[PDB]
Amino acid sequence: GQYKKLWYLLFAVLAVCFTILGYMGSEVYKKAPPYPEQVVSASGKVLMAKDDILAGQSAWQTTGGMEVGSVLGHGAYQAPDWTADWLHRELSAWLDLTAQQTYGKKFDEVSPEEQAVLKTRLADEYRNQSRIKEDGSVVISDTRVKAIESILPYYHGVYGDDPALQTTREHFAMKNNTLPSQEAREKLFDFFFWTSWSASTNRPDETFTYTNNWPHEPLINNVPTTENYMWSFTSVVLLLMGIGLLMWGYSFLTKHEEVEVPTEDPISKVQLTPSQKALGKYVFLTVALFVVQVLLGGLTAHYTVEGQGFEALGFEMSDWFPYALTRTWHIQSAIFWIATGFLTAGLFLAPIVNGGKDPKFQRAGVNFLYIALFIVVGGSYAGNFFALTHILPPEFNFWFGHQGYEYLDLGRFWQLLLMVGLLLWLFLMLRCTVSAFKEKGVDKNLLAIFVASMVGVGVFYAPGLFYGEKSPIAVMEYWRWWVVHLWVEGFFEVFATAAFAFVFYNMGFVRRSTATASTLAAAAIFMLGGVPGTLHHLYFSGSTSASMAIGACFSALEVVPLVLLGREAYEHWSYQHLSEWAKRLRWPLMCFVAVAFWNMIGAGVFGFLINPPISLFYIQGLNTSAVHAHAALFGVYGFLALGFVLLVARYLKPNVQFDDKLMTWGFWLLNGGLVGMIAISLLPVGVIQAYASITHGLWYARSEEFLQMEILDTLRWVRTAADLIFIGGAICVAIQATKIV
Amino acid sequence: GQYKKLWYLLFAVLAVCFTILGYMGSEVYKKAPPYPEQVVSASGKVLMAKDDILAGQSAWQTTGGMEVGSVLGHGAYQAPDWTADWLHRELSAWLDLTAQQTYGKKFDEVSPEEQAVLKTRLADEYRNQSRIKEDGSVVISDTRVKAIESILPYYHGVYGDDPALQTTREHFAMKNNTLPSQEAREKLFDFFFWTSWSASTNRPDETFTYTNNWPHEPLINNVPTTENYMWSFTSVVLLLMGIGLLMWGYSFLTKHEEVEVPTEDPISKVQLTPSQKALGKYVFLTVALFVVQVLLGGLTAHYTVEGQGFEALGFEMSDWFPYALTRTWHIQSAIFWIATGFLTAGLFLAPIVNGGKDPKFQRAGVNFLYIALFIVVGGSYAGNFFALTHILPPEFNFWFGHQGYEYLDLGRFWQLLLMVGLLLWLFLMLRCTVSAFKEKGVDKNLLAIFVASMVGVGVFYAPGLFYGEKSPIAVMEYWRWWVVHLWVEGFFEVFATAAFAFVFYNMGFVRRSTATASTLAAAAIFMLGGVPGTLHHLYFSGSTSASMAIGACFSALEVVPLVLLGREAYEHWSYQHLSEWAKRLRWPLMCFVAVAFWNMIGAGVFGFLINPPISLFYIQGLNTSAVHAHAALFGVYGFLALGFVLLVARYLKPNVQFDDKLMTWGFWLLNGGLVGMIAISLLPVGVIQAYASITHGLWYARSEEFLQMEILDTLRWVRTAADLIFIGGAICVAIQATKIV
Ligand code: HEM
Ligand code: HEM
Ligand code: HEM
Ligand code: HEM
Ligand SMILES: [Ca+2]
Ligand SMILES: [Ca+2]
Ligand SMILES: [Fe+3]
Ligand SMILES: [Fe+3]
C-alpha cells in the first residue's frame, strides 16, 4: 500500500541480519574446538580417546546436565563451575609437583623469583602445546598425567557416595549418588578434562584459547584480549548514539494526534462463539502453573541455605526430589504458562477476525490442543523424575529423559510433540483469517504484520531440533539460543506489539495510520539488533573472535528502543481515563504499564550491565545473570501473559467486576516482591561475588568456602522475606482470575 | 512563590554536591604525592633535594609548560608524554644494566625464565621502596642511579641544541633551544624524575601507586585496580537507569501546551538606548577573534606534518612562532571570543530589563569594559611571545609570561585584570535589574534564576587564583578544573538555558509557568552531576581511590539530560513557523538547533566514551580527547555565541535582511567541516592510537616512531581537506555578521 517504504525497510533488515547470523554459524561448525582422536602421554601411554569424551558428554546429561553445576559458563549457580574448577585444581597440582622435583618445597615455601620461573614454565606447557595437526592427537607431558590422576579422588567423592565428602555435597545441594556407576563416573571426567583443555590451549594460529581466554585464570595469563577492550568501548558509543538519535526522530516525526472513542465497547457487542467459550479452561491453567512454578522456586531456594529437607515422617527428600529436579521443573514451568497465556490470547482473537464466527470444528481443535498440552507437560515431568533416579535405562535418556541443557530440558520426544502442538495452533489461527484477507475492502496492512508475528512465534521452535545427542557442545550452544534468545527475546516483542496495536485499534483508541506505521517501524528496530545479537550468548564457549565483535555491537542496538519506553507507558495508562466503559479494562492496562517499566529496568538496565565482552568476561556464571533472568523474564513476559488472560477473562464473563481491593494488593505485592528479591538478596550477592572474580578468578567466586561466608549466607537467607510477598501477590492474582471465570 | 518545592530541591542539590566536592579537596591537600626532602643514593650520595624539584617545576613553565608535551596525562599530543616516556626509558636502562652483571647479555639474548626473574626483581625495587616516613627521604639503589645518568644525554639533546638530535625535534614540533640554559635544563629533569617516581611507587599503605597505577606499564604491573573495574561497571548502570527514568518523567509530567504569539515582535518595539547602540563593536570582535582563532588552528596543525615553515625570504619561522606559541594562542582565543559573545548577549538584555532605559553612565562603563578586554587580550599575547623566546627574565615569568598550564596560559597579572573586568560586567548587569526586582507586581521567579546564572558565570573565575608558582601539581590540577569544568561545563549550561527561557517568554513563544518550572528543574539536574563530576579530571594525577569513585558515578548523571535533547530541538525549530515576523529570526534559531545536536553527539556520546575510569586509563592523553574537545567546545558554545551575536545583530540594525544563500553556505560548511575533521582524521588516529596503548603501553602510542608510520602521517595530512571547509564556513558567517552591522 502507501506503506511501501516501511515494508521495504523491514525486508532489507531481515535479509542482512539473517546472513550475518547464518554466516557466523557456518564458522561455528568449522572453528569449534575439536575432539582429539587420542590424548597420548609423552611416553606413549594412550589415554582418553575421543569416543570416551563423547561417552562422558552423554553421561553428563544423565546427572542432571546444566542443572547441577555449570560447564563453560552456562548452567546453575550453586555447585561450582566444573571447567574453571578442574582447571585450577590441575594447575595447582602441576605446580606443587614441579616445585618438588626442582627445589623440594610446595610452591609456597618457594620465593617469588622461583614462583615466577615456575609460572612462566607452567603457562607454556599448557598454552603452546596445541592440537597436533594432520591427525587429532594431543601430546601431554608425564607431570600433567600425574597431576590429573591426583585430583580424581575428590571428584569421585563429590559425584559418588563417600562419607568423607559429606558437607561438600550438602553445600552444593547434590543428592548422594549423583552418578552411581563408577564405570561411567570416570568417563564423565574425560569430558571435564576436554572442556578444561579447550579453555587453556591457544588456537592453531592465534595467541588466545579456543574460548577467548575464558575463564579468568591469572596462573596462565587468561586475561581479556585487546579487541575484547576495543569492541566493548565501541558498543557503548553505538548505544549512546542510537538512544539520542531515535529520541531526535521521535520528536520531529510524531505529532501527538487525538481521537474520540466510540460510545460503547465495540468488542463487547460481538457475541461469544462456541470456541471462545472453551477458552475458560485455558485461563485457569495459565494461573495454575504460575502458582505451581513459584512454589517450586521457593522450594529450590531452600536447598541453597540447608541442602537437606525439613518430612522426618517418610522418605528422604533429597533422594527423589533433589535440587536438580526442582530447578528443572521451576525453569520449565515458566515457559509453559507464559506460552499458554500467549496461545489463549491469540485463540480469542482468531474468531473475531473471521467476522464473528468459527469456520468448522474449532471447539474440537481447541480441546485437542488442550489435551496435547497436558500430555506434554505431564510426560516431560515424568521423564525428568525417572531420568535422575537412574531408573530409566541410559540409552533412552536423550529421547524420554533429561536432555541436560537448560531451557530445553524436556526429552526429544516431548519436544517433537510440543512442536506438533504449536503447528496445530498456528493452523487454527491462520484458518480464521483467510476470509479477512480475501476481501475487496482496503488496507489489509495492519492484519498482514499480525499474521506475520503469529507465524514467527509458532515456527521458530524448530531450530531447537537438528542437534543430536553426540553433537559438539559449541554446536548445540548455537541452536539452543535460536529458540531461547530469538524465539523469545525478539519474536515475542513483535507479536505483543502487533497485538497491542491491533486490539487498541479495534477499540477505537488509536488511528488506522498511527497503529500500522509505528508497529511496522518497531518491527524493524526489534530485529536490527535482535537477530545478530544472538551471538552475545556465544562469547566464551567455542566461537571465534569475530563472533564477539558482531554480537557486542549489534546487541547494543537492542537496548536503544527499550530505554525510551516511557513514551508508550503513558499512552496505555491514559486509555483508562477515556470513558466509563474503558475504565473497566483497567487492570489489564495496568499490567501493560508494568511491562513497559520492566522492559527498561530489567531488560535494558540490568541486561546491558552484562552485555559488553569485558563485563561478561569476569561476570559470566554469577548471580547477576539471575538478577537479569528474573527481572527481564517475569517483569516483561509474565505481566504480558497475566494481562492477556485478565483481558480474556473479561469479555468472557461480562457480568463480574474486578474487585479493585484484591487487585490493588495483587499488583503491588508482585511489583514489590520482584524489587525486594533483587535489591536485598540477589544483587548484593552478585556484587560481592563479582569483586572476588576480578581479583582472584572465577574458581574463587564459585568455590565452596566462598559461598559459605556468614555474609553470603545471611544474605541468601533474607531472600525468603521478599519471596513470601511475591507468592502472596501471585496467590491474589490467581484467586481473582479464578473468581472471574 | 508557588514554585517553593522546585526552589528547595535546587538548594538541597547545591548543599550536598558542594560538600562532596569540598571534602574531596581537603584530601588532595593531605594525600597528594609529597616532595621528598632528599633523594639519597644507597651509599649516601645525596641527589636532587626538593627545592631543586621546585626549581625544575618553575623551569618547566618557561619552556611552554603543558603546550610542548604532557606531564602526568594533561598537555598536548605531539611531543611524547614525559612521565610515561621517562619511566620506560629508566626501566629499560635498569633492566639492561642488571641483565649484564647477572648473565652478561642485554635482556633480549636472555631466556624467558630469566626475563621473568629480572622483571619480578625490577617491580620490587620500584614499587616497595616507598617514601621513608618520619622524614621526607627516598632511598635509591646504585643501579637506579646509573640508569638515570645514562638517559640524560637524550633529554639534554632534545631540549637543547644538538646536531645529532635533529629530525626528532622536528617530529615533536619543537624549536631548537626550547630550554637554552643548561644549568636549568638539568633541574627540569629533576621534576621529570619526581613525576615518574610518584607514578611507580606504592602509596604508604596500599598496593597501588600515587596515580592509581597510571600509566599503563606492563614492566611493573601498572594495570587497572579492582575498584577501577567496579566503579566503571557501576556508572553505566546509573547512566542507563537515569536516561529511561527521566524519559518516564517527561512523558507523565508534560502536557504539550499550546500558545498564540503576539501580532508583532514585542522586542522590536523597544527603541535602542545609547548603551545598546555601543554593542555594535562587540559583535565585530566576537567574529574577528573567531577567524583569527581558526587560522591559528590551521597554522599549528601545519607543524604536525612538517615541523618547519614554508617564508624563505625573511627570518626563521619556528624560532619566533613555534608550535607551543601558536597552540597557546589558538586555545586562549577560543575562550575570549566565546566569553565575549556571552557578555554582549547579556549587556543587550540588561537595559530592556530596566524597563526601557539606562540608569546612569552605562555607556561609559561599556566602553571601559571594551578597552579593558583589548588590554587583556593584547598584553597576554605579548607576554606569551616574550616568555618563550626567553627575552623576559625568568623571575617575572609566572606574573607576566606563561603560566604553563593550559586553559590558564595567560600570566597572573592579566588573570587578575580579567577578573576585575568580569566583576565590572557583573556590576552593570545587576545594576540594570534592581528596579525590576523592586516592584509590586507578581512572579519575579523567572528573573531571580536569571540573575543567579549571571552571578555564577561572573564569579567562578576566581578559583583560578589561590594557587601559586610553587604549589604542588595535584593542587593546581584541582583549582584549574574549577574554572575549566565548573565555570564552563555546568555554569554556561545554566545561563544559556535561563536566557533561552527568558528571551522566548518575552517574545510570547512559551507560557509563564512552562518557562520558569522547566528551567528551575533543569538547573538542578545540571548541578547534580556537574559539580561533583569535576573529579573526573583528577583520576590519575595524585588523587586517592575515592576520588575516582565519586567522579565516575556522578559524571554519569551528567550525560542523562544531554541525550534526551531532541525534545528541545523541535521546540526551537518550530518557533520559526509561527508568524511572518518570527521567520526573520530564523538563523539565530537555527544555531540553537545545532547547539542541541552537538550537546548530545559531542558532549554526550564522545564525552562518555572517555568517562569511565577503565576507559580513561588506557586513553588519557590520546587523540580522542581532541575529538571530544573540538566537538563539545565548538559544537555547543561556539554555536551558542554565534547565535547570540546574530540575534543581537538583528534588533540592532532592523533594516537589513539576512541573505539566506550566504547563511545556507555558512551554516552547513561549519557543520560539515566539524564532522569532516572528526570522522576522517581525528577519530581514526585516536582509534589506531588506542589499540597500541592497550597492548604495549602509553610510552608506545605516543613515541616518535609510532606517530611517524606512513598511515598516521597520511591521516593527519587528510585533515587539511576538511579544515579549509571549516575556515570557509567561518569566513561566510563573519562576512554576514559584519554586513549586518
Ligand atoms: C518466590 C519466587 C521465586 C523464587 C524464590 C525463585 C528462585 C529461583 C532460584 C533459587 C533459581 C535458581 C538459582 C540457582 O540456580 O542457583 C531461579 C532461577 C530461575 N527462575 Fe526463579 N524464582 C522465583 C520466581 C520466578 C518467576 C516468577 C519466574 C518467571 C519466569 C522465574 C524464572 C526463573 C528463571 C528463568 C530462572 C533461571 C535463572 C538462570 O538460569 O540464570 N522465577 N529462581
Ligand atoms: C527482553 C526480554 C529478555 C529476556 C526475557 C531475557 C532473558 C534472559 C535470561 C533468562 C538469561 C539467562 C540465560 C542463562 O542463564 O544462560 C539471559 C541472558 C543474557 N541476557 Fe537476556 N533477556 C532479555 C533481554 C536482553 C537484552 C535486551 C539484553 C541486551 C544486552 C540481554 C542481555 C543478556 C546477556 C548478555 C545474557 C548472557 C548472560 C549469561 O550468559 O550469563 N538480555 N537473558
Ligand atoms: C580549521 C579549524 C581548526 C583546526 C585545524 C584546529 C586544530 C587544532 C590543533 C592542531 C590542536 C592541537 C592538537 C595537538 O595539541 O596536537 C587543537 C586543539 C584545540 N582546539 Fe582546535 N582547531 C580548529 C578549530 C577549533 C575551534 C573552532 C575551536 C573552538 C573552541 C577549537 C578549540 C580547540 C581546543 C579547545 C583545543 C585543545 C584540545 C586539547 O587540549 O585536547 N579549535 N586544534
Ligand atoms: C558540555 C560541554 C563540554 C565541554 C565544552 C567540554 C570540554 C572539554 C575539553 C576541552 C576537554 C579537554 C581537556 C584537556 O585536554 O585536558 C575535556 C575533557 C574531558 N571531558 Fe569534557 N566537555 C564537556 C562536557 C563533558 C561531559 C558531559 C562529559 C561527561 C562524561 C565530559 C567528559 C570529559 C572527560 C572525562 C574529560 C577528560 C579527558 C582527558 O582528560 O583527556 N565532558 N572536556
Ligand atoms: Ca543459567
Ligand atoms: Ca589537553
Ligand atoms: Fe539474548
Ligand atoms: Fe568535565
Residue numbers in the entry:
A (entry chain A), B (entry chain B): 2 to 311, 316 to 746
Authors' text:
A quinol-dependent nitric oxide reductase (qNOR) plays a critical role in the survival of the bacterium in the human host by combatting the host’s immune response. qNORs belong to the broader family of nitric oxide reductases (NORs). NORs are largely found as the essential component of anaerobic nitrate respiration, also known as denitrification, in the bacterial cytoplasmic membrane and catalyse the reduction of nitric oxide (NO) to nitrous oxide (N2O). Whilst cNORs are pre­dominantly found in denitrifying organisms as a respiratory enzyme, qNORs are also found in several pathogenic bacteria, including the Gram-negative, human-pathogenic bacterium N. meningitidis, as an enzyme that is responsible for the detoxification of NO produced by the host. High-resolution structure determination of N. meningitidis qNOR (NmqNOR) is of importance to provide a framework for developing a knowledge-based strategy for the design of new antibacterial agents, as well as to help to understand the chemistry of NO reduction, 2NO + 2 H+ + 2e− → N2O + H2O, at the heme and nonheme iron (FeB) binuclear centre.
For the final 3D reconstruction with C2 symmetry imposed, a final global resolution of 3.06 Å was achieved, as judged by the ‘gold standard’ FSC = 0.143. 3, FeB and their associated ligands could be modelled with confidence. The coordination of the active site in the absence of zinc was observed by cryo-EM, which interestingly showed that FeB was ligated by four ligands: the three conserved histidine ligands (His490, His541 and His542) and Glu494 [Fig. 4(a)]. The dimeric structure of NmqNOR is largely maintained by TMII, similar to as in AxqNOR. Along TMII, structural analysis using PyMOL (version 1.8; Schrödinger) revealed a cavity that bridges the dimeric interface connecting the two monomers [Supplementary Figs. S5(b) and S5(c)]. At the end of this putative water channel lie Glu498 and Asn604, which are ligated and may serve as a ‘junction’ that is responsible for controlling the proton before entering the active site; our previous study shows that mutation of Glu498 reduces the activity of this enzyme. For the crystal structure, the crystal was grown under zinc-containing conditions, which led to the observation of three zinc-binding sites, with the Zn2 binding site affecting the conformation of Glu494. However, a native dimeric structure was observed in the cryo-EM structure as the data were collected without any additional buffer components; in this structure Glu494 was ligated to FeB, which we believe is the natural position for Glu494 [Fig. 6(a)].
